[PDB]
């Protein structure tokens, strides 16, 4: 009956039992605290129960393997398996965490605001709100699109309404017989008569190219962002009316045919 | 016959034997408990047996290498191999775990509900149900599509029926000789006569562009989500009837030919 | 001639020799057991021999480095190299393991069954069987396609025959001079005369759009899944016969030509 | 002159020298054994020499750092660097190892055999042989394609000759004036006169659609895999001859023109 | 009542209590310091509070597990879980960190400057500013685009205004009957009359190809970057005027028709 | 003045100083040896100096942290940082190492040889040489393409000249009025008159399809690889001459027009 | 008042204080040295200050946790967090490091030189210089493109000017009535009259195909790299002149029309 080694072993076993008992009570208390906190705010019953069960299982596994290590059982392989499981969970949650970080960045740097008409990688609409994981926008068609923030941060973010002034472009295709200077002066008169077109900005009216069936002119004018569509429609209808009155004819697809027999 | 070192070795070997025996009985008991639990609920026989065999093999490997470590055999390489295998399994299960996390997020944030007509990255249909891993939707054609939740969370989620009001768009192509104001007033009268078109929303009737063979007008009106298709059909048929009665002719593809010889 | 340290060294060397000898016999016995088990069931000779050789090499390396560690040679670098090799093997087997997990999920959740006509990401066919790694389907052409389960789980799974009722769609292009109400009533009579078209489902017969050379009507009717193709063919032939009898003419590509000189 | 600590240090230095000397002789002997084994079979001189040099360098590094650790120099950073290098090599060899695993799977499950005409993700040809890393197929053009097995396992594997019976499809475009029943009965007579067309399989002869310039019929018949092309050619030529004899005319692209001025 | 082991245990427990108390006060002090520093500069209240809470939780977890380790509870599994969480966070923040590094590189090497018209992988505009994470450019249309720096560093960066001289290219399509030397000399005279075209640079005027309906000439001239568009427009209008005066006719799409019956 | 612990500390400090001094001299000697070896063969001065500096810095860091560990400073965090840096370097060099492994595989298995006309994923040319990292080929146009070996190993490798015999295919489009048997016999006579066409291989001359404006025949013949282009040209010119002599007319795009008004 | 354990604790605390003080002075001295070195060469003030701050923070964290470990506080979790941060930084810098390695390889193997006209994955231009991270090329248009070296190493590198001789190809489309031998002899005479066309290289003049409206000949000739464009232009203009003189007519798009009513 040794008094040193046996007492050391008794200390080890009592310490292991204390460790496991304290771990059990700690897991129970933290489970109760988490349940109370989740009750204190909005939460789903099923998801909250799953979360509490998962954290309880984790803590009881921790204390069980700690007691095993104190007893003398090597738990290095169990630690390796737990690390592998944690890495698997991290890889699984990589996407959601990346979306969360992207949402944080979007909140911080404010590339776009609520109620701001923007285009995000092929989808354009007025932003309603930005959440932690994904934004919500309403298209001009009236559809609702929910875009995760990670793919928003990736790629360009076109902000339409950041600049108060935007430029219109008109492609006018008239017949080759039309008088170049006459067309240019008619277009210039139309541009001058318009009050919503900025006068200090460049007003480009030039012959752009020679198409297959027509000669294409380019008309580039700037206007306020909130009036661009109306300016475009007004200038287009005015151009059509003026060309019809002045005899300028928009040509149909031309063709040159040669007869055989 | 030493009394300290030999007794220490005897303690080590007896402890190793106790560890392996306890590990075997623990593996057997946990296997029985898992089998009973899987019997208590719905499970496949083959899959349940494979799962029980895998967990049994894992636990017996744990206790065997623990006994080896207690005896004195270094098991660091075995731990390295087991960690590599765990990492391989984690990488393999990354996709399924990501789908599970995405499904949890879809349940939580509720981007779309059951019975809600939505479009998910090129496929549109009415959602039937959302499971842990994948959703199910029925297309308007009547087909069933099962979409994993990970690729739903990735990319945009178009929700058609979230907004009660959606906008229609009509592209009317009439001949260049038609009277612009007459066409506009006919379209406006048609829009006014329609009761299902919202009057407080913007009712756009403008000349949109000058096409190759026709002048294109744009007609944009809003209506309730549940009547959009009928409104479109009614307005289209009414437009055709009114243009036929009023003499406005939709032009066939025009061509200008010039003869040689 | 010391009696403590030298005896400790003798214990160490004898223990190392015992460890390596036991490792060799254990490797031989497990190799024999694996060979016997592989003989007891279906296996390839070359692949089984390679597997047995690989596991034998692994076990002998384990016991050799364990003996080195017991002797006193540090094997941490060898453990690092073995861990790197295990990680490389895990990355290599990631694809096959992912396919296995996907196959397990396909068995469990049963998105599609054997003999069920489905479309899987661009390939459509009747499923023959689902294996652990890949499925087999026969296309309507008669071809055999083997699809790994991972890419099945990734992306949508269109199930054609899950819903007993599917909807047909007919696009009828008639000349602009045709009477809208006459065409609609002829189509409605044809739909009513058909017994295989469900009457309780919506039977849509509306003017869909105004094409370049014709006005397009939309005919949407539902029918049983096993009769959809025959219903389509019958309705199409009936429509052609009725339009030919009633004088409704399907227009050829129209063109409007204007002569110069 | 202490007798315990100094003797311990002498033991340490002698053990380190023994370790390094034994490591050198072991590296030399294993290098000789590897060289002899590579001589005993087919190998490249340059590649074999590089492999032997690499393994020799690895073993000498192992024994050198082991001697350093025995002396008392901590080699944890060296172990970290070696682990990083091993991980880099594993990532580099991931592709080749994945190809090897894919080849093993292809050998095991036998999705396709030698001399079997298959299509593998856009390339179709008769398989010549399957190696450890890549297969070889000959296209019908006579070209040789070497396909790595990893990208074969990824994606679908279309096996043309697995099913002894395949289905042909004929798209016949005849003028709108042609008699539907007459065309159907002529096609049916042609199908019946053919002996290589399976009679127990479905023989589909229906009006498929109404094209822009013609009405398209669908003819679907099954035949043996080794006669499909000849059956197609024979049926096509027979159809042309019968339609020419019976007056059925395949229409050229139709056009409806309207004159102005 | 032992005096060595019990005193050692008392030292351990007192040291653990000291460690946890010092950890708590250190966490509180560093939280106060971080809050003060964030108050001293621009910061969001919510984000700053979340950051302080996260760092406080991290530090208290560190000191709690340190106290557990001092007491004697093994915390290796907790360390494994914390390492997995850290790896998950690192993978999540990989994108933002890559953008930060790319922005640093863009600042250092200066591929483009503010106010410099450039094209970045499909989007072209004048750069306004470069931030830590993303740049801002204004397109010629007037739109604002925010581009993350990582995708700028990836792929090419076209710098339009780095070179003071750029080359124009004119594609002139004239009828086959036109005189080649006459067209060449007219184009050369037009090029010579232009003062904004560099004379020391190559002035290419050659017959480029034989098109379907015309023979295409290539005109390549260099000019200053700030005058390229005006030079193009002037040369184009001058070419049209000179060809109209000289009788050179730009041909409409030719066609050769042959009559049957 | 203790004689045990103080002497132990003196041993520790002297051992640390010896370790650092030996590390410095070893780093210097290995740097000199590496510089001499790089001088003995072809090397760049800048790259060699950078490599020597990097290895010197690595070795001095190793010995410095080893001396710190011997003194008693824990260097685990430094080891963690060094491991992270090594992993970063491994990820950076992954691409180059993968190219090296792919080049080794290409040398070993010999999918293609020097001077062998092959196509490698969209680029076709005659291979000049294969290096450790990338190959070089000359296209038929005369251009030089350098292809990294990794993307060669990935994807298919089309070897044109591996098979001595390749098959030609001729698509002949003749008018619908032409006599099928007459065309077939003319083509067969042309095929028979050709001596470079293999007679034992299948010589396919069949009516392939019914095109929009012509009936398409398929002519498939085999020939030696070194004469395929000349055989194609000769057969094509012979076919044109024979059809022109025999009255068979290749039809221009047909059109059927119907007049209105 | 014990004299062994208390003196050991005093040694530990004094050693910890010495470690932290030495760490602080070492961090300060290395910060001063780094600042001096960065002053001695070109550097940005902001970036240099950030780098010095980062390295100072790293070193002070190292020494602080070392002092904690010496005192007795376990810092394993802190080491885990630092390792996670290092891995995150490594993943972030992976792209830049890969670009650096690719640039080193480009310098070493010299796939292309400065002033060498090459095409790099869709962009072609004359290379100006190659830096550590990215190259710079000027397109023939005069634009400047900066290409990171990683995407240069990935994918093919087309080197236009490596081969002194390149081959031209001319596609000549003449009417079906033209005499084949006459066209061939005219083309051959044109090829012979050209002195810049290599005579020892193959001069291919054959009928290539039968197009919809013309018969296409292929003309393939080789020339020096620095004269290819001029040779092409000269041969093209000569061909047009000779065909116009000899009566050979390049046909316009043919059409065969058939009249109804």
Q: Are D163 and D225 in contact (CB under 8 A)?
A: yes
Q: Which residue of G has its CA nearest to F257?
A: G259
Q: Give the 3-state secondary structure of residue A138.
A: strand
Q: A218: how many CB neighbours lie within 10 A of its CB?
A: 16
How would you label B184-197 residue by residue, b for 16+ Cβ within 10 Å and e otherwise?
A: bebbeebbeebeeb
Q: Which residue of F has its CA nearest to G220?
A: F141
Please enumerate in sequence order all residues whose Cβ is within 8 A of that of D15, keeping only pairs 6 or more positions apart, or say none.
Answer: C72, D70
C97, C215, C256 ranked by CB distance to B255: nearest: C256
**CA-based nearest residue to D251, from D211, D220, D218:** D211
Q: Identify the H or E element spanning G208.
A: strand G204-210
**CA-based nearest residue to C148, from D95, D153, D108, D120:** D153
Q: Are F165 and F224 in contact (CB under 8 A)?
A: yes
Per-residue H/E/C for D156-179: CEEECCCCCEEEEEEEEEECCCCC
| Cα atoms found within 13 Å of the Cα of residue F51, Cβ hemisphere only | 15
DSSP state at residue F165: E
Phi, psi (rounded to 5 degrees) for A6: -65, -40
Contact C88 D94 (CB under 8 A): yes
The pairing of strands C254-260 and D117-120 is unpaired
CA distance readout (Å), D44 to D27, D38, D51, F104: 21, 9, 10, 11
Please, what's the largest Cα pairwise distance for chain F? 128
Contact F250 G160 (CB under 8 A): no
Q: Which residue of G has its CA nearest to E95?
A: G92
Question: Residue with structure tokens 């205004």?
Answer: E161
Touching A (3+ Cβ pairs <8 A), the chains are: B, E
Please enumerate in sequence order all residues whose Cβ is within 8 A of that of F101, keeping only pairs 6 or more positions apart, or say none.
Answer: D92, D93, D95, D96, F150
Residue G219's DSSP bridge partners are G170, G205
The pairing of strands D144-148 and D134-138 is antiparallel
**CA-based nearest residue to B191, from B161, B164, B167, B226:** B167
Strand ranges across the sheet with G204-210: G165-174, G215-224, G204-210
Taking the C-alpha atoms of residue C125 and residue C136, their distance in angstroms, rounded to an integer, is 9
Q: Are A188 and A170 in contact (CB under 8 A)?
A: no
Taking the C-alpha atoms of residue A141 and residue B220, their distance in angstroms, rounded to an integer, is 9
DSSP state at residue E227: G
Taking the C-alpha atoms of residue F1 and residue F9, their distance in angstroms, rounded to an integer, is 13
Does C have 3 or more CB contacts under 8 Å with E? no
Decide if D236 touches F, using CB distance below 8 A: yes
- Resolution (Å) of this entry: 3.7
Q: Give the 3-state secondary structure of residue C114.
A: coil
Please enumerate in sequence order all residues whose Cβ is within 8 A of that of G141, keeping only pairs 6 or more positions apart, or say none.
Answer: E166, E167, E169
A62, A94, A176 ranked by CB distance to E91: nearest: A94
The pairing of strands A157-159 and E144-148 is antiparallel
Does B have 3 or more CB contacts under 8 Å with F? no
CA distance readout (Å), F113 to A152, B95, C181, E234, F137: 48, 41, 73, 56, 11
Q: F176: how many CB neighbours lie within 10 A of its CB?
A: 16
Question: Residue with structure tokens 């059909």?
Answer: B233
Q: Are D41 and D77 in contact (CB under 8 A)?
A: no
Contact F157 D151 (CB under 8 A): no
The dihedral built from the CA positions of residue G229, G235, G238 and G239, taken in this order, carries a sign that is negative
Instruction: For domain B110-159, give its CATH number from 3.20.20.300, 2.30.30.60, 3.30.450.260, 3.30.413.10.
Output: 2.30.30.60
**CA-based nearest residue to E179, from G190, G237, G229:** G237
Residues in chain B with CB shorter than 8 Å from the CB of C222 are 142
Q: Are A231 and A168 in contact (CB under 8 A)?
A: yes
Q: Where are the domains of chain F?
A: 5-106, 110-159, 165-246
Q: Give the 3-state secondary structure of residue A164.
A: coil
Contact E83 G87 (CB under 8 A): no
State how far residue E241 is from chain A, nearest Cα, in angstroms. Answer: 9
Please enumerate in sequence order all residues whose Cβ is within 8 A of that of A80, keeping only pairs 6 or more positions apart, or say none.
Answer: B79, B82, B83, B86
Q: Give the 3-state secondary structure of residue C153.
A: helix
Compute the C-alpha angle B31/B37/B39, nearest 5°: 100
| Alpha helices, DSSP H, located in chain E | 5-40, 45-71, 76-109, 149-153, 180-193, 228-246
CA distance readout (Å), F218 to A178, F70, F174, F251: 52, 84, 12, 17
Taking the C-alpha atoms of residue D105 and residue A211, their distance in angstroms, rounded to an integer, is 59
For domain D111-159, the question of CATH label 3.20.20.100 is answered with no
Taking the C-alpha atoms of residue D214 and residue D71, their distance in angstroms, rounded to an integer, is 92
Please enumerate in sequence order all residues whose Cβ is within 8 A of that of B69, keeping only pairs 6 or more positions apart, or say none.
Answer: A74, A76, B75
Q: Are E152 and E122 in contact (CB under 8 A)?
A: no
B80, B148, B173 ranked by CB distance to C79: nearest: B80
D143, D151, D240 ranked by CB distance to F158: nearest: D143
The pairing of strands E254-260 and A254-260 is parallel
Instruction: Compute the radius of gyration of chain G from its Cα atoms.
Output: 36
Q: F233: how many CB neighbours lie within 10 A of its CB?
A: 15
E104, E207, E222 ranked by CB distance to G237: nearest: E207
Residue count of chain C: 261
DSSP state at residue F156: -
Taking the C-alpha atoms of residue B238 and residue B173, their distance in angstroms, rounded to an integer, is 15
Please provide the CATH number assigned to the domain covering A165-246. Answer: 3.30.70.100
Please enumerate in sequence order all residues whose Cβ is within 8 A of that of C145, keeping only pairs 6 or more positions apart, or say none.
Answer: C123, C125, C136, C137, C138, C139, D156, D157, D158, D159
Q: Which residue of E has its CA nearest to A86?
A: E84
Six token digits for residue C42: 């279906």
Q: Which of G13, G77, G153 has the highest number of chain F CBs within 10 A, making it the mutation to test binding with F? A: G153
Residue F46's DSSP bridge partners are none
Q: Give the 3-state secondary structure of residue A244.
A: helix
Taking the C-alpha atoms of residue A205 and residue G20, their distance in angstroms, rounded to an integer, is 74
Taking the C-alpha atoms of residue E196 and residue E200, their distance in angstroms, rounded to an integer, is 12
Taking the C-alpha atoms of residue F83 and residue G190, their distance in angstroms, rounded to an integer, is 69
Six token digits for residue E117: 């018209």
Taking the C-alpha atoms of residue F104 and residue F98, their distance in angstroms, rounded to an integer, is 10
Q: Are B217 and B229 in contact (CB under 8 A)?
A: no
Residues in chain C with CB shorter than 8 Å from the CB of B44 are 107-108
DSSP state at residue A225: G
Phi, psi (rounded to 5 degrees) for F137: -135, 155
Six token digits for residue A252: 């149909």
Does E have 3 or more CB contacts under 8 Å with A? yes
Q: A108: how many CB neighbours lie within 10 A of its CB?
A: 12
Q: DSSP for D16-62? A: HHHHHHHHHHHHHHHHHHHHHHHHHS---HHHHHHHHHHHHHHHHHH
Phi, psi (rounded to 5 degrees) for G173: -110, 110
Question: What fold, for C5-106?
Answer: Helix Hairpins (1.10.287)
Taking the C-alpha atoms of residue G44 and residue G49, their distance in angstroms, rounded to an integer, is 8
Taking the C-alpha atoms of residue D160 and residue C138, their distance in angstroms, rounded to an integer, is 10
C-alpha C176: how far from chain center: 47
Taking the C-alpha atoms of residue B215 and residue B208, their distance in angstroms, rounded to an integer, is 8
Question: Residue with structure tokens 């990355």?
Answer: C91
Q: Which of residues 87-126 of D touch C (CB under 8 A)?
A: 87, 89-91, 93-94, 97-98, 100-102, 104-105, 107-109, 111
Taking the C-alpha atoms of residue E124 and residue E138, their distance in angstroms, rounded to an integer, is 8
Question: What fold, for A109-159?
Answer: SH3 type barrels. (2.30.30)
Q: Is F63 exposed, middle or buried (0-12, 13-18, 19+ CB in 10 A)?
A: buried
Same fold, E5-106 and E109-159: no
Q: Give the 3-state secondary structure of residue A12.
A: helix
Residues in chain F with CB shorter than 8 Å from the CB of G173 are none
Contact D100 C93 (CB under 8 A): no
Q: Are A19 and A66 in contact (CB under 8 A)?
A: yes
State how far residue D18 is from chain C, nearest Cα, in angstroms. Answer: 11
Please enumerate in sequence order all residues whose Cβ is within 8 A of that of E261, keeping only pairs 6 or more positions apart, or say none.
Answer: G258, G259
Q: Is C184 exposed, middle or buried (0-12, 13-18, 19+ CB in 10 A)?
A: middle
Taking the C-alpha atoms of residue F189 and residue F209, their distance in angstroms, rounded to an integer, is 22
State how far residue A143 is from chain E, nearest Cα, in angstroms. Answer: 23
| Alpha helices, DSSP H, located in D110-227 | 149-153, 180-193
Instruction: Compute the radius of gyration of chain C from its Cα atoms.
Output: 36
Taking the C-alpha atoms of residue C97 and residue C91, their distance in angstroms, rounded to an integer, is 10
Six token digits for residue A72: 């003398």
State how far residue D113 is from chain F, nearest Cα, in angstroms. Answer: 19
**Helical packing angle, E45-71 and G76-109, nearest 10°:** 110
Q: Which of F7, F11, F61, F62 has the highest number of chain D CBs within 10 A, making it the mutation to test binding with D? A: F62
Which method, experimentally, gave rise to this model? cryo-EM
Taking the C-alpha atoms of residue G146 and residue G150, their distance in angstroms, rounded to an integer, is 12
Contact F101 D92 (CB under 8 A): yes
Taking the C-alpha atoms of residue G102 and residue F158, their distance in angstroms, rounded to an integer, is 28
Q: C76: how many CB neighbours lie within 10 A of its CB?
A: 19
């Amino acid at each position: 009956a040794n008094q040193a080694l046996l007492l050391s072993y008794a200390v080890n076993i009592v310490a292991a039992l204390a460790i496991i008992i304290v771990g059990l009570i700690i897991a129970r208390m933290i489970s109760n605290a988490v349940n109370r906190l989740m009750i204190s705010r909005k939460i789903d019953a099923t998801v909250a129960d799953f979360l509490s069960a998962l954290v309880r299982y984790g803590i009881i596994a921790f204390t069980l393997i700690a007691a095993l290590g104190r007893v003398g059982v090597q738990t290095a392989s169990v630690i390796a398996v737990l690390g592998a499981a944690g890495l698997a969970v991290g890889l699984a949650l990589q996407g959601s965490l990346s979306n969360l970080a992207a949402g944080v960045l979007l909140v911080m740097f404010r590339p776009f605001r609520a109620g701001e008409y923007v285009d995000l990688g092929g989808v354009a609409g007025t932003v309603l709100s930005v959440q932690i994981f994904s934004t919500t926008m309403r298209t001009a068609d009236g559809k609702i699109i929910v875009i995760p923030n990670g793919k928003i941060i990736a790629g360009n973010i076109i902000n339409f309404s950041r600049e108060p002034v935007r430029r219109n472009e008109f492609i006018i295709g008239v017949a080759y017989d039309s008088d170049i200077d006459q067309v240019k002066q008619i277009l210039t008169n139309i541009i001058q008569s318009e009050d919503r077109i900025l006068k200090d900005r460049e007003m480009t009216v030039r012959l752009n190219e020679l198409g297959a069936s027509s000669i294409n002119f380019v008309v580039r004018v700037w206007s306020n962002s909130g009036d661009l569509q109306n300016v475009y429609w007004d200038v287009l209808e005015r151009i059509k009316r003026e060309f019809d009155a002045a005899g300028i004819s928009f040509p149909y697809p031309q063709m040159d045919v040669n007869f055989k027999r």
